[PDB]
Amino acid sequence: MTEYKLVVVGACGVGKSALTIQLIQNHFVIEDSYRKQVVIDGETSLLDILDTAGQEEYSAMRDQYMRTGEGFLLVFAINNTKSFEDIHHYREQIKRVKDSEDVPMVLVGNKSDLPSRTVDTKQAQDLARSYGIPFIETSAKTRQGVDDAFYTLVREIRKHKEK
Ligand SMILES: *[C@H](Cc1ccccn1)C(=O)N1CCN(c2nc(OC[C@@H]3CCCN3C)nc3c2CCN(c2cccc4cccc(Cl)c24)C3)C[C@@H]1CC#N
Numbered sequence: 542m543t544e545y546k547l548v549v550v551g552a553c554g555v556g557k558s559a560l561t562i563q564l565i566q567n568h569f570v571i572e573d574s575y576r577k578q579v580v581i582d583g584e585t586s587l588l589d590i591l592d593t594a595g596q597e598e599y600s601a602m603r604d605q606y607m608r609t610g611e612g613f614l615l616v617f618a619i620n621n622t623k624s625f626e627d628i629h630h631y632r633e634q635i636k637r638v639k640d641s642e643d644v645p646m647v648l649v650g651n652k653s654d655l656p657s658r659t660v661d662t663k664q665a666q667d668l669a670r671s672y673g674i675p676f677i678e679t680s681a682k683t684r685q686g687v688d689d690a691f692y693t694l695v696r697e698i699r700k701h702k703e704k
């Protein structure tokens with residue numbers, strides 16, 4: 542089977558852990574990684590997901606863990622404008638460690654189940670279009686779009702590996 546190293550990044554409290562746990566265990570709730578065997582478009586895939594946590598620091602060991610990622614989920618929360626404005630920073634750090642302008646990534650607007658949204662869908666769609674990447678709205682609470690976010694990311698890695 543093909544293994545894919547995925548990293549989930551984004552601002553404090555956006556739901557990076559809740560998204561990973563919902564994917565792995567189908568439940569709603571320190572840095573660790575989680576493995577899950579899945580079938581995507583008929584191909585059995587082993588997803589190895591790093592749920593980013595800890596302090597902001599740029600040691601060689603921190604860069605080496607992040608560089609291990611083949612694709613990244615850039616997560617913001619639809620009710621947190623600051624988390625959306627922080628997406629640029631996370632994308633910047635991914636391109637730096639991967640040393641490439643072309644890295645598989647998916648923009649994820651999480652907490653779509655909450656009312657009182659502050660980031661409009663159109664604004665996130667236009668940003669993703671500028672980056673040349675997919676945008677998916679998710680809810681780790683109701684599971685809406687969770688599988689679609691990780692599977693779309695695997696499809697982006699496949700597109701990158703084929704080219
Ligand atoms: C929130 C922590 C929290 C919990 C409870 C109370 C208060 N805070 C959390 O999960 N964090 C924040 C710290 N950290 C990182 N934060 C940033 O940037 C935060 C912010 C935005 C821009 C300027 N800055 C003040 N950036 C990173 C991390 C973790 C390390 N990151 C990193 C390091 C080396 C290479 C990398 C390559 C690609 C991607 C990343 Cl994330 C890389 C950068 C951890 C989390 C947020 C996350 N993820």
Ligand SMILES: Nc1nc2c(ncn2[C@@H]2O[C@H](COP(=O)(O)OP(=O)(O)NP(=O)(O)O)[C@@H](O)[C@H]2O)c(=O)[nH]1
Pocket residue numbers: 551552553554555556557558559560570593594651652653654655679680681682683
């Ligand atoms: N309503 C709602 N709440 C969510 C959703 N995803 C996460 N949360 C809530 O948001 C908070 C943060 O979730 P968590 O998964 O810890 O986020 P994190 O990005 O991993 N945080 P940390 O930065 O500390 O590592 C929790 O109270 C969690 O229940 C979602 O889709 N909808």
Ligand SMILES: [Mg+2]
Pocket residue numbers: 557558559592593594
């Ligand atoms: Mg977490």
